[PDB]
Structures are given as C-alpha cells and as structure tokens.
C-alpha cells in the first residue's frame, strides 16, 4: 500500500543508479527519505528494500546501526548538539540551557509542533569552534543565548 511520491522515487532512483552496484546506494537513499519525511517511516523500508534488491531484514539492520537515522520522531529541524569532550569542556551545557530557555525542550525531545528536535551527538569534527551544533545541515558555534535565538529564528 505504502508508495513513495514520484519526486522522491525519482531521487532514490538517481542514487541507486549512481554507484556500480545498487546496494551501495542504501545510505544515500536513507538520508534522502529522512530529509523528505523528517524521519524514517517504518513502512518505507519494504519498498526501499525492493528498489535496492536487498531483503527487508538487511535494510532494517542498517537503519538500526546508523545513529543519524530516526524511526520514531518526525522533526522538521534536527538540532544536533555535540556532547563529546571538547564541546563539553568549552560549554555544551550552556548551549543546552539556552536551547531549553528558547524552545522549552531537552536532548531527545521534540517541540509540540514537531518543528525542532534536539539530538545529542558525538564529536562533529569542529572542535576549535566548540560548543558546536547543527540545525539540519547547517553548522554553527554557539556564542550566547541572544546569538542562538537569532539563528533559530531563521528556521520557520
């Protein structure tokens, strides 16, 4: 019953046709789906498996293994907040407190409107700019609550 919209199916086909072997496209495909829906719908995996010519079990195992994928919470904007050593030293907790002040949520939580989810992540490879966060694909250094509030106001 569950079918991909054509604009999304077309994009997945591009990924599948990109590498020499179709199965190589699995992670690009999963990123695409998550970008489209705000999460990985459980019902998407079966048809994805068919396009990849892989068993459903294989696809599920891959989704479970890779931490960037989320099969539970739909969110328009993922605020990934680094919680590793350098950001922790340089003020992860200040960023988190500012986020709770502005949005009223803590890591792992989603705002009631589905707009923002906070995702604690390991080192984002930007440690000189600690404390680091992403909003979907955009990455930033946290300076202060006022600065953060302005950045988040760009995401409507």
């Amino acid at each position: 019953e569950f079918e991909f919209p054509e604009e999304l199916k077309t994009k997945l086909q591009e990924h599948i046709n990109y590498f020499p072997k179709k199965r190589q496209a699995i992670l690009l495909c999963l990123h695409e789906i998550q970008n489209y829906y705000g999460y990985i719908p459980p019902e998407s995996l079966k048809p994805l498996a068919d396009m990849l010519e892989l068993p459903l079990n294989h696809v599920e195992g891959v989704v479970a293994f890779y931490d960037m994928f989320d099969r539970e919470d739909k969110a328009k904007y993922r605020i990934r907040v680094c919680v590793s050593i350098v950001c922790h030293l340089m003020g992860t907790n200040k960023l988190l407190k500012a986020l709770e002040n502005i949005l009223g949520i803590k890591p792992g939580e989603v705002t009631p409107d589905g707009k923002f989810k906070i995702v604690p992540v390991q080192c984002l490879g930007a440690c000189s700019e600690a404390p680091v966060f992403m909003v979907n694909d955009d990455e930033y250094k946290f300076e202060s609550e006022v600065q953060l509030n302005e950045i988040l106001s760009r995401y409507t």
Binding site: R23, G125, V132
Partner: protein, 418 residues
C-alpha cells in the same frame, strides 16, 4: 552554488602547502586551483609509469596521516603485487574527538584532494575510486560532488584522461553516524551497503578489500600530499622537516588555547611549540594539565617537549591536540572519553562490546560519587580488559587514554575514591 553553513575554523601555515588556499575559509573552485598550477602534477604523473610514481611516494617517506603512520609507498607496492582489478578509497570519515584537519581541505581546497586521488588511482591501476565522507559533513559532500563535476568538465576525470588511456570515476559515499566506519575494513563493509563491521586482519585491504579485490585506503591528508611529491620531486619533499619524518603535517588544536584551529607545521615542532608558539598559549595563561591526543593518548605537562612526529618518543596519532588546563577535572574528562567508546563500539567482540559499556557506566557512578567498592575494582578490571579478542583498533585502545590518566594523575582519582 549555495552550500550549508560551516563555522570558519582558523587555519595557519608555516609551509604554505596543504593550506596554501585552505588557510582562507571559503571554497576554492577549479579556476582558482588551476591558476596556482593545479592539475599539473596529474599531467606529469600521467606521463610517468605507475611504478615510478610509487617509487617517488616511497622515497618521499610519506606516512599515513590517518593516525597510524603506515608508509604510503609500501602500502601501494603491496596492492600492485596482487592481480587486478583494484580500488582506491579516500577515507574522509574523520570522527576522532578533537579532529577537524581533513574537513578544511575537503571544504576549501577540494581539488587538492581530487588531484591526489587521480594520481594515486593511476599509480595502483584503479579505474574506480571512492570518497567516503561522514554523514555529519554535508557541506563537504556537496562541495566534493560539485568539484568532481568541475574536474570532469575540464577532462581530469572520465575515460581516456588527457589522452593517457587511463579511465577513472570517483564516487562519493556518505556515512550515517558511526565512528567505526572510519576503520578501513568497516568503511569497506559500509561501501558494500552493509553495517560497519570491521573484518579480521590480515588480510589487509591491499590483499582483499572492496568486493574482495586489492584496495588501497588512504586518509584525506595523506592523499593531499601526493600532488606535492610529484610536483617538487621526492628529494625536495624530504627536505621539508626532519629527513626521517618529512613533509607538512596538519595539527587540529582545540580546548583551552587562545587560538584554536588547524596549523600546518613540520614534524620536528614540539608539542610545547604547538600550544605556546603557534596556538597563542592557554586561555587565561593557566598551566597546562594534560593534552589529549584525540581519544587515543593523554600527555602530562611533563611531556610537552616531545616532537610531533611518528617516532617512538613522539606524539604520533592524527596530531590532534586537545588542551586541558589546571582547573579541568581529569575524571570528568575521562568520563567523556569513556562515553565516546560506549557510543561507538560495533559490538562484534564480546570484551569490547561489554567493556566499552561497563567502563562508561561504572565511571559515571564514580564521577557522581555513587560507586560501591566493587564498582571501583570493577572499573579498574574492565578498563584493563576491553582489548582481548578484539579484531580492530577501537577495542585495542578504548581503555588506553583512561589508563594513562589513572597512572599520571593518581591524586585526582584517589579523591574520587574518597
């Protein structure tokens, strides 16, 4: 065209090689790259035999910048000893804590990397090459995709490159959250569309890798050196830094320094010089307590006068320098390292699976003051017993840094036992 936001990491060079352009925080496209002589090393390489290129890279004494420092030329020789076809993989997974050296090459001077990939691929007879970039580097992904297209348009990729009869496509794969996918065999598994599970080595990839074929995996920074070796010749390259450990090296410096960023320096520079001469010293002029070499090693303030080379007494690793000063709690810091390994073990090996988990769980109890005597003794045991039966380097090192803190800062740990 338009790319996701990237913070502007500070970059400074004494050698003006890897960071000649990447010292400026913006994308340098193919025309800018060509003006400085971009792709001329490739043209020169295509007029050399693959064997000669390997010889030069060997005599340059280039060593793997991914952190293990394996001789690059020797690695290549090993691969070419085995029947084709062969594959070339650029490792852009960079996920070690404190480590952000490779991304500035990717994001600011992608053609330096691409040029290296093409030369290296030609040298080992690979017609298919890969960049595997972590999923948390989306800007890098799109910047690489656009650069590859630019290179194609100018005839540096495709069939019959510049009339040489050499064919190459470079495919860009993305990670999706696993540090372990930077381990070369797990990277290969991920490229094959599977979970990122390391394989028993040997075989090394140069014997059996992608689809079981001879595969060279090299780090971004390693590959970025290849242009220069062909350009200057190996002799002139070896005149950079100490003759034993030659060439430029990138040093991502973070934590409690005035000037955090990437420094391009020779490898006879000392750790003290990195911190004080180049990175501006410590915040608040506080005393250095420790340096964490990523999540691999912990150096005390009595070990600052070591060279930043691949020698036995040297700093080694990725060159990653995380500075803690006198008020930073070493146990709090160790907990963060334990937490990292807990989140990244792939779980294939039992002592690694359980050890990484228990080390974090028990250290947290210790830190919060809720650890029983048994918890304490258990922590010590577990820390010394993550390595057994391990088939990759994660299991082998997940207790290493923490053990080093235990030996070098006993007074601070003993306070937690109180």
């Amino acid at each position: 065209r338009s790319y996701p936001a990237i913070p502007r990491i500070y970059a400074e060079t004494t050698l003006n090689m890897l960071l000649k352009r990447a010292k400026k925080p913006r994308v340098h496209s193919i025309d800018e790259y060509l003006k400085d002589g971009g792709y001329q090393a490739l043209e020169k390489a295509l007029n050399m035999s693959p064997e000669e290129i390997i010889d030069w890279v060997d005599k340059s004494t280039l060593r793997g910048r991914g952190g293990a420092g394996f001789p690059t030329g020797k690695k290549w020789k090993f691969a070419v000893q085995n029947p084709g076809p062969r594959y070339f993989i650029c490792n852009a997974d960079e996920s070690e804590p404190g480590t952000f050296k490779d991304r500035i090459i990717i994001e600011r001077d992608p053609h330096l990397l691409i040029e290296g990939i093409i030369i290296s691929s030609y040298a080992i007879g690979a017609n298919e090459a890969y960049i595997y970039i972590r999923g948390e580097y989306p800007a890098g992904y799109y910047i690489l995709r656009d650069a590859i297209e630019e290179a194609k348009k100018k005839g540096f990729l495709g069939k019959n490159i510049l009339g040489s009869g050499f064919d190459l496509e470079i495919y860009v794969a993305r990670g999706a959250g696993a540090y372990i996918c930077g381990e070369e065999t797990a990277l290969i598994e991920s490229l094959e569309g599977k979970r990122g599970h390391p394989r028993l080595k040997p075989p090394y990839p140069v014997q059996k890798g992608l689809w079981g074929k001879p595969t060279v995996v090299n780090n971004v920074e390693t590959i970025a050196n290849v242009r220069f070796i062909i350009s200057m010749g190996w002799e002139e390259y070896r005149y950079i830094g100490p003759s034993d450990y030659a060439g430029p090296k990138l040093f991502p410096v973070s934590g409690k320094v005035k000037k955090p960023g990437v420094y391009e320096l020779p490898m006879n520079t000392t750790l003290r010089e990195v911190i004080f001469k180049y990175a501006g010293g410590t915040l608040g002029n506080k005393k250095v307590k420790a340096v964490f070499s990523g999540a691999l090693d912990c150096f005390s303030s009595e070990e600052l006068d070591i060279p930043m080379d691949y020698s036995p007494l040297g700093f080694g690793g990725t060159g990653t320098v995380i500075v803690l000063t006198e008020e930073d709690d070493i146990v709090e810091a160790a907990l963060k390292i334990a937490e990292f390994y807990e989140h990244e073990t792939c779980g294939q090996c039992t002592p690694c699976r359980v050890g990484c988990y228990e080390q974090a769980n028990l250290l947290e109890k210790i830190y919060k003051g809720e650890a029983t005597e048994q918890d304490w003794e258990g922590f010590d045991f577990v820390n010394r017993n993550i390595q057994p039966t391990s088939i990759c380097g994660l299991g082998a090192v997940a207790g290493r840094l923490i053990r080093q803190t235990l030996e070098k800062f006993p007074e601070e740990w003993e306070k937690y036992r109180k």
